[PDB]
Amino acid sequence: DILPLSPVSRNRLAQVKRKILVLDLDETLIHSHHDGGTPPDFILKVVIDKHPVRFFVHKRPHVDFFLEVVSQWYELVVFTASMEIYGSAVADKLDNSRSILKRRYYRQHCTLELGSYIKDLSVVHSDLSSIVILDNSPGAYRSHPDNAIPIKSWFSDPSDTALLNLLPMLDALRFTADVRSVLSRNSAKGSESNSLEQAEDLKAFERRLTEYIHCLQAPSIIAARCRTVLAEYNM
Ligand SMILES: [Mg+2]
Numbered sequence: 001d002i003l004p005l006s007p008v009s010r011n012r013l014a015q016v017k018r019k020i021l022v023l024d025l026d027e028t029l030i031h032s033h034h035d036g037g038t039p040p041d042f043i044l045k046v047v048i049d050k051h052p053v054r055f056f057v058h059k060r061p062h063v064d065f066f067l068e069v070v071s072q073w074y075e076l077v078v079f080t081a082s083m084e085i086y087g088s089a090v091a092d093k094l095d096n097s098r099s100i101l102k103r104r105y106y107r108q109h110c111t112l113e114l115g116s117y118i119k120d121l122s123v124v125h126s127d128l129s130s131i132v133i134l135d136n137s138p139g140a141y142r143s144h145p146d147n148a149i150p151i152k153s154w155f156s157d158p159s160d161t162a163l164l165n166l167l168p169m170l171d172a173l174r175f176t177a178d179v180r181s182v183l184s185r186n187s188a189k190g191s192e193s194n195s196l197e198q199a200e201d202l203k204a205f206e207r208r209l210t211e212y213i214h215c216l217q218a219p220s221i222i223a224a225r226c227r228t229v230l231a232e233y234n235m
Contacts, residue, residue, distance in 0.1 A: 001065075002072060002171075003229045004222050006211055009175060012204050016177045020125050021074035021170070022133040023101075024140065025090050026082065027153040029067075029163075032057040032090070038156070044089045057090060060154045064096070065232075066163035071100040073174045077124050078104040079133065081117035081140070118142050129178040134166070146184040164234040172208035176201040 005013070023029060032044070032055045040056035047053065070076065080087040084106040095101040105124065110117035116139030125131040133141050134149045141148040149170075154160055173182055181201030185192050193199035215226030 001228065001232060002069060003212060003215060004218075004225055006207075009204075009208055009211065012175050012207075016175065016204075017127070017130045019074050019174055019179060020077055020131045021070055022077045022079045022119070022121060022124055022131065022135075024119075024133075024135040024137070025078060025080045025087060025094075027136045027155065028134060028151060029060050029063050029094065030057050030090060031060070031155045038158075042093050044086070044093070046085045046089055048083065048085060055086065057093070058156065059094075060163060061158060061160050062163045063094070066167070067094065067100060068098070069167055070170055071098070073171060074132070076100050076103070079109070079119045079121075079124065079135075079140075080105070081107050081110045081119070083107055113142070114139075116140070116142065120144075121147055129180065132170075132173065132179050132183065146180040148183065161234045164232075167233050168209065168212050168235075171212075172205045175204040175208050177204075181205070 026032070034053055034055050038058070041059040042057050044055040044057060045052060046055065067076070078087065078091050078101055087106045088104060091101045091104050105119070107117070109123055110119055116137070119133065119135070119140045121128065121131050121133060121141070121144045128144065128147055132147055132149060133144065134151055135141055136151050136153040138150060149166065151162055151166070154162070173179055176182055177197070178201060181198040182205050193202060215229070216223055218226060
């Protein structure tokens with residue numbers, strides 16, 4: 001369920017650092033509500049301030065497939081402003097014994113600023129060339145906009161495919177030496193690059209995308225894995 005890599009891309013991947021994908025929970029991968037219409041995916045029972053509370057949790061469409069794929073490309077880290085008792089239980093259910101969401105950071109690791117919880121990425125990994133955050137609240141990565149992938153907030157829309165639409169970009173991004181080469185772009189000029197090093201990172205980024213676009217001109221077997229990838233990645 002992952003497109004085959006070219007010999008060039010595979011060699012490039014060995015020449016660059018391993019990368020971390022920081023993942024938010026609420027309105028990014030799940031949406032939940034407590035007591036006070038579709039059946040929830042799971043129900044958490046957590047006691048907070050010694051009062052028992054029920055949370056009905058809905059998974060964003062395709063989150064399990066999404067996590068299965070990106071866990072092959074990045075080290076996944078949960079960074080949430082929720083209380084550990086809640087965030088930890090959600091992560092346990094999301095991980096579902098796959099052992100990909102074992103590293104978590106909760107409210108006690110966020111900085112509060114102008115009513116927003118800031119998730120200081122350097123808490124997770126201070127080499128900012130090799131860390132990325134996927135979060136629906138831009139306030140959460142206010143201190144690291146160059147390392148952020150924004151995503152629409154999700155609450156219930158069953159037709160949402162945003163997690164699927166992120167997969168080829170997240171695939172291509174892991175071939176850069178510095179993720180900021182790509183994420184820092186996203187006023188009058190037409191320059192996407194400001195250095196030869198950034199330009200080389202965009203060449204690598206685009207090379208992987210090229211493998212997506214032209215995968216159908218490959219031999220039988222590679223072409224069959226391509227058709228599978230395109231039919232699965234909502235393209
Ligand atoms: Mg959120």
